[PDB]
Amino acid sequence: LKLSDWFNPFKRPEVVTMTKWKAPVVWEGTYNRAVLDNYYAKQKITVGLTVFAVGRYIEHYLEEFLTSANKHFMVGHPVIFYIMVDDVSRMPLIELGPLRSFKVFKIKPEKRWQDISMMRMKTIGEHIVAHIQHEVDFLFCMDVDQVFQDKFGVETLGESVAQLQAWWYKADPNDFTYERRKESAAYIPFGEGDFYYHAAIFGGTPTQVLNITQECFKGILKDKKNDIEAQWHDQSHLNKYFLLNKPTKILSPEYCWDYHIGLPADIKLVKMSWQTKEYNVVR
């Protein structure tokens, strides 16, 4: 498969469509999903999707996330949803459609929400080694407080996939909220950086995602050891990781949009949107 076989950057001249290391940035209008569905279907791929719901997030977001995923995620290809919750008795079983199935695991609820978010890196890694590596060809790891709004398909697959954070995609690197303290493993010096990635969505082959999570958790552990916590937790470490190990594909903010921003000309068709945000329950 050649990049030119399914990707035409000339359809979106007003946004960044190719990185300096030749990785494509996928925006609505640049991909030929029909070509990709055929190619991947012929290889009979299976895609995994992990999602964590702890505490109030279960009743507030899990059902909406799973229902929408079942409807819009990798339609036409086998998908396995890996659900991690602290209380399985509340795991909202919904009806899944053709080619979708699931596997639920009960996890420990971390006291601090910051740790609930960060420990995912450890847990995902353990699961990739234990079984996911044998079950799927590609894997995505996502925040639960989001909803699929339209088709999120095979055009998003790749060795290592990153998401452009909706609020900073047009900002210059020196303005990114990377971790700036040299004392943290997530430290990124001013004068460095390609894009500001969103930890709400990342993926790739099981091998690559294993390295992403393992390296991120190592930094998370190193920081705890030195009594320091990155301001943006796992997102900060993920950004450090992606700086050192460039993603082979990046998804535009259309794949992870926050309507609080509005709806600028660049956002042509939203595939997934941030949930309200909260402000009351959840935590």
Ligand SMILES: O=c1ccn([C@@H]2O[C@H](COP(=O)(O)OP(=O)(O)O[C@H]3O[C@H](CO)[C@H](O)[C@H](O)[C@H]3O)[C@@H](O)[C@H]2O)c(=O)[nH]1
């Ligand atoms: O009480 C909680 C808290 C967190 N989470 C899990 O952790 C994820 C990330 O936390 P939030 O959604 O609450 O936080 P943000 O929206 O701020 O997330 C952003 O910041 C985080 C660190 O602050 C991570 O980097 C995350 O991937 C990124 O999208 C949630 O989707 C959820 O799956 C829970 O289940 N229950």
Ligand SMILES: [Mn+2]
């Ligand atoms: Mn979130």
Ligand SMILES: [Mn+2]
């Ligand atoms: Mn918002």
